[PDB]
Structure 1
């Protein structure tokens, strides 16, 4: 139940960057879990609140 404290291991983070047009292909798609994510930069939460 406890909040984790030591940094936990995470699934690899594939970064799709979908455009105006693209040619999608799924040969050599990963089978084990991956975190698909669409945007290049997402450490947007930077204002730490003591």
Structure 2
């Protein structure tokens, strides 16, 4: 139940930039869980509060 402290083993994160038009195809898709994200540079919360 306790919050983790040691850096955890996260699943690999595939970024799919999504353009106005694109050819989606699912050959060679991963079967293991894998987080998918649309934007790059998503580490936006940079203003740390002491």
TM range (shorter): over 0.9
Q: Which runs of 5+ in 1 are unaligned?
A: none
TM-score under structure 2 length normalisation: 0.97
Q: Distance in 2 between matches of 1:39 and 1:29?
A: 20
Structure 1 segments of 4 or more deviating over 2 A? none
The structural deviation recorded for 1:13 is: 0.1
The structural deviation recorded for 1:10 is: 0.3
- Does the residue aligned with 2:7 lie in a helix, a strand or coil? coil
The structural deviation recorded for 1:17 is: 0.5
The count of corresponding residues between Structure 1 and Structure 2 is: 50
After superposition, give the CA deviation of every residue in 1:7-47 in whole Å (9 maximum; x if it has no partner): 00000000000100000000000100000000011110000
Q: Which runs of 5+ in 2 are unaligned?
A: none
Aligned CA-pair RMSD: 0.4
